[PDB]
Amino acid sequence: SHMRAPLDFRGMLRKLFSSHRFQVIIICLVVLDALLVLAELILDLKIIQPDKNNYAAMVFHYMSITILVFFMMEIIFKLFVFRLEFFHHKFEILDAVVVVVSFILDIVLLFQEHQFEALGLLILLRLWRVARIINGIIISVKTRSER
C-alpha cells in the first residue's frame, strides 16, 4: 500500500535492533556469504567446466544480481550509517548504473558468440559489489570508532 503506512517509526525499530545486534549482523553476513560462495564452489566443481552457457548461466546471473542488490539494500536499510539526506547522491545512483551495465553485458555476452566469458561479468560484479559493501561498513565503523 502507498500513502498509508509508517516510515519514521519502522525505520527506528529496524535500525535500533540491527544496530544493537551489530555482531549478529556482521556474523550473519560473513556466514551467509561464506556459505553461499563455498556451496557454489563445491557445486560448481562438479561441472568442472562451462558446458552450457544459456539456462544455468541465466538463472545464475539472474539469481546472483537479484540476491546481490536485494541483500545490499536489505542490510543498508536494516542498518544505516549516515546517508546524506533522503535523496540519492551521485555515488548512490552510480552503483545502480554500474550494475546495470555489468549485468546487461554479462547476459549479452552469455548468449553472444564466444561462450565461456559471460560468467566473468558476474564474478567481478559481486566482487566489487560485496567488497564495496563490507569494506564500506568496516572502514566507516573503524574510522568512526575510537580506532
Three-class SS string for 3-66?
CCCCCHHHHHHHHHHHHHCHHHHHHHHHHHHHHHHHHHHHHHHCCCCCCCCCHHHHHHHHHHHH
Select from 9, 133, 10 the least CA-distant residue to 75.
133
Reduced to 3 states (helix: H, G, I; strand: E, B; else coil), residue 100 is helix
Q: What is the grid cell recorded at 24? A: 549478529
Range of the domain at 140: 1-147
Specify the long-range contacts of residues 111-118, CB closer than 8 Å, at least 24 apart: 111/53, 111/54, 115/50, 115/53, 116/49, 116/50, 116/53, 118/53, 118/57, 118/61
Select from 97, 101, 112, 99 the least CA-distant residue to 57.
112
The technique by which this structure was obtained is NMR
Q: Which residues of 17-54 are buried (b: 16+ CB within 10 A; e: fewer)?
A: ebeeeeeebeeebeeeeeeeeeeeeeeeeeeeeeeebe
Q: How far is CA 119 from CA 49, 111, 141, in A?
A: 12, 11, 33
Q: How far is CA 138 from CA 9, 26, 141, in A?
A: 26, 9, 5
Q: What is the grid cell recorded at 48? A: 568442472
Dihedrals φ, ψ of 142, to 5°? -65, -40
Give the span between the Cα atoms of 55 and 110, in whole angstroms: 10
Give the span between the Cα atoms of 135 and 40, in whole angstroms: 22
**Domain count for the chain:** 1
